[PDB]
Amino acid sequence: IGNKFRISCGLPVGAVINCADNSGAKSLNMIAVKNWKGHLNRFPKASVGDMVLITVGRDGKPELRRKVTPAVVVRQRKVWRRKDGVWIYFQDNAGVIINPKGELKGSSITGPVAKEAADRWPKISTTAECVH
Amino acid sequence: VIDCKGHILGRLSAIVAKELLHGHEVALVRCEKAIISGAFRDVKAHYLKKMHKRTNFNHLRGPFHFRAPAEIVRRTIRGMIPYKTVRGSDAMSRLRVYDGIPPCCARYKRVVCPSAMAYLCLRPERRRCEVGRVAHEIGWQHAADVERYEKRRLEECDKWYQDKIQIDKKIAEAAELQRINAELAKYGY
Amino acid sequence: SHRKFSCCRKGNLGYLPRKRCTRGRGRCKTFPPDVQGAPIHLTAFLGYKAGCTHVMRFIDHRLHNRQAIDQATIIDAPPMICTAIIGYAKTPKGLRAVTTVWAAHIAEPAMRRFYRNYFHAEKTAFSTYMKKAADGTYIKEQLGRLKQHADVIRIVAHTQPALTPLKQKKADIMEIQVNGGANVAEKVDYAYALMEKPISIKDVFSVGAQIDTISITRGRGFEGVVTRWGVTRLPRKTRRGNRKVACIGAWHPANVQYTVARAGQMGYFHRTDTNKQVFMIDTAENPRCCTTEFDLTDKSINPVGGFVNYGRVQGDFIMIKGTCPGPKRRPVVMRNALLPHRNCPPVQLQWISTASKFGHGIFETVEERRQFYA
RNA sequence: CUUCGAUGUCGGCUCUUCCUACCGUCCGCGCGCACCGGCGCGGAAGCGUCGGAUUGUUCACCCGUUCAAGGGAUCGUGAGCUGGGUUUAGACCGUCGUGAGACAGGUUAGUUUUACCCUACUGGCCCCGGGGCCAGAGCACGGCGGGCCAGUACGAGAGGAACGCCCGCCGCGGGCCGCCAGCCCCGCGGUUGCCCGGCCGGGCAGCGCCGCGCCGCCGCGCCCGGGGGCCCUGCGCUGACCGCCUCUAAGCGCGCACCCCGCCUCGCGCCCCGCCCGGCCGCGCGCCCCAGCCCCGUGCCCCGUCGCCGAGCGGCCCCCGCCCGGG
């Protein structure tokens, strides 16, 4: 939804991020980013508000493991410049599990959620307790 | 001073190359109106094919390909001269090529090579393209300027024509022995 | 062999040869087209770049009705006096000049230009010209020859360096076209009426338009391909080192090609950035230039601390959105843009930064510092 | 055939060009083309052709993604590297041999030497004013979306476009420091052993280490990339040869991520002004058209041969300090 404004691409492939939603699992590891065409050697990099494919880890729920799922990162540690010039850096790396049509698997998103994710994905905005 | 309106870009460059090497020194004017025989699309692609020939390692050591038409006529007369040897270097220098008649060579008496003229050479419907139009599509950006100037020159030469008959009619009117001997005494010259 | 995976050439081949610019200051080499029938305008101005600021603005593009902060560069501009009129005809060969009527009275800043060292100089420049003119009968007669034979009229003008904080003490002469106007005469008369008179940025350019900053970029000396062109450092275990391009060519062509990456002079080369908007055209003598109705106090272009590595800008200043080529105090020329962005945002500035660029400053004006510290 | 008084030999990395027998995008055209989508052409090399698991592996195969053509350049590329592989000497194992040993059977361990020469490439230099302009040479924006169109055309539904304008992202390219990162040349604070008799304040441990940090680079930050001309394949228009027809024969329109020029980088030389304003050299113009060709099919024919005055138009030379401080 909308046109994304460029942020800082905080997370490259191989990053393990925590899971904000309950139905997801503690570790969500990036595998690929959506709409990624890059020059040689560039590790596909994602950022808050992009759709990234994640794999539930060994620590995660047995039922959801061993599969590749879509996700949008909610909390990105790296500083990014919103147009108003504020640079906001979240405390820890984390993400939510969303179907490509916007369906969050979990009942609620827990932890402060980025403004950028809310605009791009509508359901996240309704279920985010403390938008920052 | 051989004007090049209607003259073949190869055949004029044969008459003029022998003259330079013989040691005569000539100036070519109205160069853009010379004709490169063949259909324009093919003639344009034979030059836009020559302009692809360039030294891969440094296009600066490469063959220089010239777009303005005075150069296009002279690079041709360069092939028909031993440019590298001294007797050739003196003759390439002895050629002054002017695109359009400049004020430098305007007053000079003008002669044309009838034999190398496309009119007397190519059959009607052969299809001919003027180096000037090839020049514009190969990269000449000075086409309008040389046509504006040439119009203004042909205009001041139209006023001059009225003045010129008057001076030369008075000369003829005052015809008051060589006329009755040099061409009239068992000589017929 | 085929390369294997595919990647583009690193570097722009059209920006070669990468040499320190021979041209001392940016030469436009182009000017916006005449469009006979436009109001008679001028197309250029010289200024010494000052420092960047960061200003809030109101954006109305489609983010509509939102506020954004964006860097703007103050190009200090002094009024630049006009010294001459040049008429170039458009003959087959190219732009060829048909003489220039320099002005009878030329100041010391522009006289300084002809001689390398002023104190020990013959100071003979324009001795005869001043004498032959002055009555002005000759000057007019030669301006008449420009009107009769010329098609492009350019007014040569000298920037007064004393007004700027620049240490040069000698003017950098420049040529500005007087494009527009119904006929050559109107342009010539426009040039005559500006002769020996200050030309100000206010007259030449307007807020909301985009202009192209031309200049000489900052320089670094010899720099290796990694920091010049951008080739990837080879992996850590390389004998002879990692910071280089491993293959400079193929056995054929035997000679190395011009397209390969080669170590040389990084920086100090002519570059023209393009389509930069003029956020603010103003005179620093006014003490409220940064005062907006959403500022509610008094500020001006001079930042607390001074423009870092620059002077005071006690003169007219043009603020251009975005970075421009050149380090501070490098002469930066400006031209009306040749083809600006079709759809740009309207410019309304609601706050301009004034705190010290030196260090980190949280005090917009000098007074606030002494009150905060008490 | 060339090389055995030696052409470093496999792949990878890094990087540069090239070719079309073109996968996507560009322009058409054909469908068993309703739409979406597929499939076949002709012009087309501009741009894109990725990120990874295994293997030394070119290849292979799978997993992703903006869904991913093929090759060439001494199997491009070792005085560029890496040595995993192969390919010496150590060592196993299996088979073969009475044995020394063998193996296009597998397994481990095993110096990658030299440019200061010449070219080439890249930058730099050779005392002479400023301000410009040309010839030449380089040459750069492609691609993907969202928005309105539009849930519209189309469709029985199921599904489902588009031109146009706007807004973004990706790739690349040129810049820049305010912002925020990163850095710290000798700044300020902390601390540890030892040496200065203790305090103060200092050294020494090759910056002892730690916490910030300025000018400045810099990126992970920001800023900028909107244009013309011929035309290709063709699609057409009038109109024949050939009582019709017709895209073509004569014409004539439209016309491609291609091409050529602009912008842009470089630029030998040249122009103008200033200083000075000096010398030298030449002597000569109607145009247009060839199926009106309007009188054609001539003239000059002597640049020293006796021409050379001037006038008037061109040319042609013509002219311009450093050292020394700071950037």
Side-chain angles (χ1 to χ4, degrees):
Chain A
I1 279 231
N3 305 314
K4 179 194 131 127
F5 270 47
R6 192 232 280 105
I7 35 239
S8 281
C9 280
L11 298 120
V13 285
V16 181
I17 84 219
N18 320 317
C19 193
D21 64 289
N22 187 57
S23 285
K26 343 264 293 114
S27 120
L28 297 187
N29 338 310
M30 305 207 9
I31 280 181
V33 188
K34 250 49 183 296
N35 262 295
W36 185 255
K37 190 247 285 118
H39 110 292
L40 233 77
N41 302 298
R42 196 160 282 132
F43 293 5
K45 9 171 113 285
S47 34
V48 139
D50 301 340
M51 218 204 315
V52 0
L53 289 196
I54 41 125
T55 15
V56 157
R58 253 221 185 102
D59 47 86
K61 240 178 248 206
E63 13 188 26
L64 2 142
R65 216 180 291 165
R66 276 107 226 196
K67 252 120 32 215
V68 189
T69 4
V72 152
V73 228
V74 283
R75 297 188 233 125
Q76 170 202 328
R77 241 246 191 91
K78 159 117 209 81
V79 79
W80 71 81
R81 193 220 215 219
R82 317 204 144 143
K83 29 253 132 110
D84 341 286
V86 262
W87 289 81
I88 155 165
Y89 69 98
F90 269 85
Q91 190 172 1
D92 71 275
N93 300 281
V96 65
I97 316 209
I98 44 105
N99 268 274
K101 315 291 292 162
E103 258 62 45
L104 13 106
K105 223 217 316 241
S107 227
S108 39
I109 318 209
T110 352
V113 146
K115 210 247 343 113
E116 267 101 347
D119 334 305
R120 309 242 46 224
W121 293 82
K123 246 208 214 282
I124 298 182
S125 187
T126 83
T127 350
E129 0 92 278
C130 300
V131 220
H132 275 292
Chain B
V1 210
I2 325 179
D3 294 28
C4 322
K5 163 144 214 191
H7 293 244
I8 296 263
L9 178 118
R11 269 126 119 108
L12 203 61
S13 300
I15 293 146
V16 164
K18 247 310 210 219
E19 301 320 272
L20 253 15
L21 280 176
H22 260 100
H24 297 333
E25 159 127 42
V26 277
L28 308 184
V29 275
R30 233 154 37 191
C31 282
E32 69 242 5
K33 340 248 295 290
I35 3 217
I36 320 186
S37 168
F40 158 76
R41 184 183 136 194
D42 86 70
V43 164
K44 197 219 4 214
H46 186 40
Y47 281 81
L48 238 27
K49 117 196 200 122
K50 227 150 4 186
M51 252 135 260
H52 178 88
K53 277 152 189 17
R54 240 186 286 286
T55 282
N56 203 36
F57 69 89
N58 217 325
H59 285 331
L60 266 171
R61 306 214 113 172
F64 295 138
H65 285 293
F66 291 88
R67 339 262 129 98
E71 273 78 32
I72 305 195
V73 189
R74 143 184 230 139
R75 172 146 297 260
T76 305
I77 315 166
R78 234 194 48 158
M80 332 210 178
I81 250 129
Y83 94 102
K84 260 149 179 9
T85 85
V86 6
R87 211 186 38 108
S89 247
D90 303 329
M92 271 328 281
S93 306
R94 271 185 228 122
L95 165 79
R96 352 177 247 242
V97 259
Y98 292 121
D99 53 284
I101 319 223
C104 324
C105 269
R107 309 241 282 231
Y108 278 26
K109 279 173 166 1
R110 293 133 170 187
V111 265
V112 277
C113 293
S115 58
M117 287 218 50
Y119 98 91
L120 261 194
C121 271
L122 288 192
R123 53 145 32 120
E125 265 212 22
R126 212 267 115 158
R127 258 209 291 271
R128 35 208 110 180
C129 151
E130 258 96 345
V131 51
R133 195 207 156 182
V134 120
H136 160 66
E137 333 263 10
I138 72 193
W140 189 31
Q141 328 115 274
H142 290 334
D145 306 345
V146 311
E147 201 271 339
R148 171 211 146 170
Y149 271 54
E150 274 282 275
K151 195 28 114 203
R152 299 158 359 148
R153 173 202 129 259
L154 271 204
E155 127 218 325
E156 208 34 68
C157 280
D158 216 270
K159 197 144 184 44
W160 180 71
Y161 178 48
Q162 248 48 59
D163 297 29
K164 107 137 256 338
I165 177 161
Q166 305 157 191
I167 149 101
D168 300 56
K169 85 199 174 349
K170 295 156 31 247
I171 295 171
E173 148 218 349
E176 327 256 3
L177 179 105
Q178 303 112 47
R179 287 84 48 184
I180 357 163
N181 247 240
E183 33 121 342
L184 268 183
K186 257 15 204 173
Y187 283 159
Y189 250 53
Chain C
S1 170
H2 62 298
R3 170 176 174 136
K4 268 324 160 292
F5 309 148
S6 136
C7 163
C8 5
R9 141 118 248 245
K10 258 82 48 218
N12 191 291
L13 271 145
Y15 272 126
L16 271 164
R18 271 130 118 100
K19 17 163 317 269
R20 286 173 231 122
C21 54
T22 251
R23 297 117 144 108
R25 130 234 137 216
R27 308 307 214 241
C28 47
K29 288 259 118 210
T30 0
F31 263 151
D34 230 276
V35 199
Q36 150 176 354
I40 343 207
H41 53 298
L42 276 114
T43 200
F45 212 94
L46 216 126
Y48 313 100
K49 183 216 187 104
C52 302
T53 37
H54 111 65
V55 294
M56 217 151 218
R57 49 175 325 209
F58 219 23
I59 321 235
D60 279 69
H61 89 313
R62 339 274 109 91
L63 234 257
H64 190 154
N65 290 136
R66 288 243 332 226
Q67 84 282 298
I69 241 132
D70 54 340
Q71 167 252 335
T73 283
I74 284 297
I75 310 267
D76 145 72
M80 55 173 350
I81 325 283
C82 152
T83 27
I85 159 183
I86 276 243
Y88 304 110
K90 284 127 108 117
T91 99
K93 300 124 228 149
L95 265 89
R96 287 278 161 248
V98 61
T99 84
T100 163
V101 218
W102 257 82
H105 309 81
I106 315 119
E108 184 248 65
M111 224 58 114
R112 268 254 235 283
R113 167 74 37 196
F114 325 98
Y115 336 102
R116 152 106 236 97
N117 217 322
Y118 207 64
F119 202 65
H120 336 284
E122 207 39 78
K123 258 97 59 204
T124 31
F126 286 89
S127 48
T128 337
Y129 195 86
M130 260 239 60
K131 268 315 276 327
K132 88 165 123 147
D135 28 67
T137 65
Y138 155 80
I139 278 216
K140 271 148 196 83
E141 115 209 350
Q142 237 237 46
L143 248 106
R145 121 210 248 178
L146 296 201
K147 260 167 337 236
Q148 198 212 334
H149 296 263
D151 313 283
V152 181
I153 304 293
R154 294 207 184 143
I155 142 241
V156 202
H158 83 93
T159 138
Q160 287 218 335
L163 310 177
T164 97
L166 261 255
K167 93 157 222 278
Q168 279 169 192
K169 282 202 252 181
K170 69 172 7 183
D172 326 67
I173 332 275
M174 205 237 304
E175 239 150 347
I176 304 153
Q177 190 172 334
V178 250
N179 16 241
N183 251 279
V184 44
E186 281 316 295
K187 317 156 48 85
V188 147
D189 285 33
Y190 199 34
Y192 203 27
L194 226 25
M195 236 186 48
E196 294 183 14
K197 273 232 19 125
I199 303 146
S200 12
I201 18 161
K202 179 105 207 348
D203 331 313
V204 184
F205 300 129
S206 153
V207 42
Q210 305 196 309
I211 55 195
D212 316 303
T213 38
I214 126 188
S215 210
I216 308 105
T217 51
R218 313 167 288 109
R220 330 245 288 122
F222 223 57
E223 281 270 10
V225 280
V226 181
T227 327
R228 190 197 216 205
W229 286 105
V231 320
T232 311
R233 300 172 300 112
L234 264 48
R236 38 139 291 113
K237 19 196 312 205
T238 310
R239 206 167 326 231
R240 285 91 139 139
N242 63 304
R243 314 257 339 255
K244 262 131 341 103
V245 27
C247 311
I248 59 173
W251 202 315
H252 287 253
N255 320 78
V256 188
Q257 344 197 22
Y258 74 104
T259 64
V260 86
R262 275 312 209 190
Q265 162 70 46
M266 221 325 270
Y268 208 47
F269 25 56
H270 200 171
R271 278 308 119 85
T272 60
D273 246 17
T274 149
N275 303 353
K276 343 225 46 131
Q277 225 176 126
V278 213
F279 270 175
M280 163 175 1
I281 305 213
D282 263 327
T283 138
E285 292 283 75
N286 162 68
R288 305 204 10 253
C289 3
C290 156
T291 287
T292 80
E293 237 336 280
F294 321 108
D295 171 64
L296 235 107
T297 190
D298 238 54
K299 344 216 119 132
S300 182
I301 222 29
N302 241 167
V304 234
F307 286 101
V308 66
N309 283 133
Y310 196 66
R312 265 208 35 252
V313 193
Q314 14 128 161
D316 322 334
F317 50 96
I318 13 169
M319 196 185 249
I320 50 113
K321 166 225 17 97
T323 76
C324 104
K328 311 121 198 135
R329 106 211 66 118
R330 167 93 17 118
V332 171
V333 209
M334 264 100 22
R335 319 168 303 154
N336 278 127
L338 315 178
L339 27 120
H341 207 90
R342 213 214 127 180
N343 259 56
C344 52
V347 35
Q348 154 120 327
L349 253 50
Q350 317 163 283
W351 170 279
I352 291 108
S353 158
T354 340
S356 190
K357 300 325 162 159
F358 186 56
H360 325 300
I362 51 139
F363 311 113
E364 270 288 281
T365 174
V366 244
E367 27 259 27
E368 282 168 353
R369 154 129 164 155
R370 248 59 57 98
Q371 301 318 109
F372 173 86
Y373 283 130

